[PDB]
């Protein structure tokens, strides 16, 4: 339903001339117009909201979209590292580095601290 209603090969302004018709007073008349009365309510998100809230304080704009309805607001996502969560390899590089970190920390705690 992304087709656009655009009129081609037909005039869009019905005025014969700018001087003879008082366009400067009455403006231009429209022909072949696709009238669409849109009564969308700005501040709908603000309707019935407490004063001390994010919507009123910061996001009190004309046509703000709520997170629950905004389809491009992201929840936390992505992979922390390049390692596959479901990997069948008995890989031990991560374990080796974790062991190095832990043993270094333990040596500091048990031999050096204090």
């Amino acid at each position: 339903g992304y087709e656009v209603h655009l009129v081609k090969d037909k005039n869009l302004i019905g005025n014969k001339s700018f001087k003879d018709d008082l366009v400067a007073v009455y403006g231009f008349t429209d022909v072949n117009d696709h009238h669409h009365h849109d009564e969308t309510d700005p501040y709908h998100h603000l309707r019935g909201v407490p004063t001390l809230s994010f919507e009123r304080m910061y996001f009190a704009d004309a046509y703000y979209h709520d997170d629950t309805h905004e389809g491009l607001m992201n929840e936390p996502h992505g992979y922390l590292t390049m390692d596959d969560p479901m990997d069948l390899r008995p890989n031990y590089e991560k374990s080796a580095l974790e062991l190095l970190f832990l043993v270094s920390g333990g040596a500091i705690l048990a031999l050096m601290l204090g």
Binding site: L72, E75, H77, G78, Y79, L80
Partner: protein, 72 residues
């Protein structure tokens, strides 16, 4: 006001328009433990804090606290 929102790849761990549902509990469990850590650091550091005398106090030059020169 701001720029128009555009899709962000799911696989990419980025902060573009990230909002967390559990942010209340996350804040609760990130604030108080940090407060306790800072309290421990503060009480540890207070042992090595120095303050000048109060309004009605004077430092006796012969008291041990008074500065002492090196004795060769």
């Amino acid at each position: 006001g701001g720029f128009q929102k555009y899709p962000i790849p799911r696989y990419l761990h980025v902060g573009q328009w990230i909002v967390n549902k559990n942010w209340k509990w996350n804040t609760f469990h990130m604030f108080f433990p940090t407060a306790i850590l800072c309290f421990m650091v503060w009480r540890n550091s207070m042992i090595s804090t120095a303050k000048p005398p109060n309004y009605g106090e004077y430092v006796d030059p012969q008291s041990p606290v008074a500065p002492k020169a090196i004795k060769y």
